[PDB]
């Protein structure tokens, strides 16, 4: 719910993120359909050239079950990954809003 979505391609996330009530930092984590356990963070942002865009970051899987976007910090779950980037952008194009 809210932020986690299963069976949402890149283009479906973009359409969702780019909708009216969303702002910069509006995001969603989506799970791959042809590949379970492969996640993607999608964030709505601004490009000086294109305007409102949606940026996609691959969530890497740790062998022990946790995840991470950047090698500098890893998490045990997606909730922790989200809570982190909502309180600091830490490399992300923007801090997520939620």
């Amino acid at each position: 719910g809210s932020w986690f979505f299963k069976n949402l391609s890149r283009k479906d996330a973009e359409r969702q993120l780019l909708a009216p009530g969303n702002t910069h930092g509006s995001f969603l984590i989506r799970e791959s359909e042809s590949t379970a356990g492969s996640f993607s963070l999608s964030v709505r942002d601004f490009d000086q050239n294109q305007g409102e865009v949606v940026k996609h970051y691959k969530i890497r899987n740790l062998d022990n079950g946790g995840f991470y976007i950047s090698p500098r910090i890893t998490f045990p779950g997606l909730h922790e990954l989200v809570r982190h980037y909502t309180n600091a952008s830490d490399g992300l194009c923007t801090r997520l809003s939620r």
Binding site: S40, K55, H56, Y57, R72, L92, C93
Partner: peptide, 6 residues
């Protein structure tokens, strides 16, 4: 495709 992060 995917955004890289340092």
């Amino acid at each position: 495709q995917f955004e890289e992060i340092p």
